[PDB]
Design a protein around this ligand. Structure first.
Ligand SMILES: OC[C@H]1O[C@@H](O)[C@@H](O)[C@@H](O)[C@@H]1O
Ligand SMILES: OC[C@H]1O[C@@H](O)[C@@H](O)[C@@H](O)[C@@H]1O
Ligand SMILES: OC[C@H]1O[C@H](O)[C@@H](O)[C@@H](O)[C@@H]1O
Ligand SMILES: OC[C@H]1O[C@H](O)[C@@H](O)[C@@H](O)[C@@H]1O
Ligand SMILES: OC[C@H]1O[C@H](O)[C@@H](O)[C@@H](O)[C@@H]1O
Ligand SMILES: OC[C@H]1O[C@H](O)[C@@H](O)[C@@H](O)[C@@H]1O
Ligand SMILES: OC[C@H]1O[C@H](O)[C@@H](O)[C@@H](O)[C@@H]1O
Lengths: 109, 109
């Protein structure tokens, strides 16, 4: 997987992968982007033993990490209002959240 | 491949594939979306005498099918100005263009 749409997220251990790039929600609750085994970016929210966290792209365009409970720990704070958004791990090493839908075929089944 | 970014395109014979869906820029210049083997969406540009067309997501948000000579055979008319856009073939069978980045890790290489 390389992207997340409204309501989708990464549970502890889950990740997006493209080439040697890896964006993962770890069992220490740290959200990290790796090039091979080298860490490149992180939410700096890790704590050994803090398992069960979840990262989720929401309807408001906000990407949030929650704990085993449902308490927030980190967020891009990119709330822009209800709509359709997507988070993508790009081939250029960048992780991006995109505006809202501007066009579609409308062929959802 | 399941997405196109600014200025990327599908050339004759190329496609985006999120089984069972297939968005293919056919040799006959017709851009078609198939569910398994059934066509469900089309640009309706299989004009006689046309060959070597390409479908490209433009920096202005517009998605347009061009003929060998660079003529506009079809467009989504989704022009929204200059920015960053991404067209994606979703697992729900829908083809969507998400308009302009609202957040990023800023980790491009
Ligand atoms: O910042 C993220 C980006 O940084 C670059 O220097 C490389 O390490 C890439 O592999 C990575 O995607
Ligand atoms: O309309 C869908 C259908 O159109 C026809 O003209 C051809 O281009 C076929 O390849 C395509 O499946
Ligand atoms: O800075 C990145 C680094 O932060 C912490 O040390 C842990 O979450 C590691 O798993 C991670 O690689
Ligand atoms: O700070 C995190 C917080 O930001 C906003 O208030 C909303 O998007 C909430 O859903 C989210 O929990
Ligand atoms: O019209 C855009 C919107 O259509 C449907 O609701 C779904 O396919 C969404 O994923 C998509 O963002
Ligand atoms: O009508 C299609 C036409 O729309 C706009 O003018 C631009 O996006 C052009 O590049 C494109 O060819
Ligand atoms: O800042 C967002 C922007 O960053 C860079 O320019 C590229 O990775 C683009 O694809 C992305 O949309």
């Amino acid at each position: 997987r390389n992207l997340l749409t409204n309501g989708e997220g990464l549970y502890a251990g889950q990740s997006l992968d493209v080439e040697p790039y890896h964006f993962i929600m770890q069992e220490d609750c740290n959200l990290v982007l790796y090039d091979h085994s080298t860490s490149v970016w992180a939410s700096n929210t890790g704590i050994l033993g803090k398992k069960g966290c979840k990262a989720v792209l929401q309807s408001d365009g906000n990407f949030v990490v929650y704990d085993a409970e449902g308490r927030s720990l980190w967020a891009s704070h990119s709330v822009r209002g209800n709509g359709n958004y997507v988070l993508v791990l790009q081939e250029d090493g960048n992780v991006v959240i995109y505006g809202s839908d501007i066009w579609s075929t409308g062929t959802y089944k």
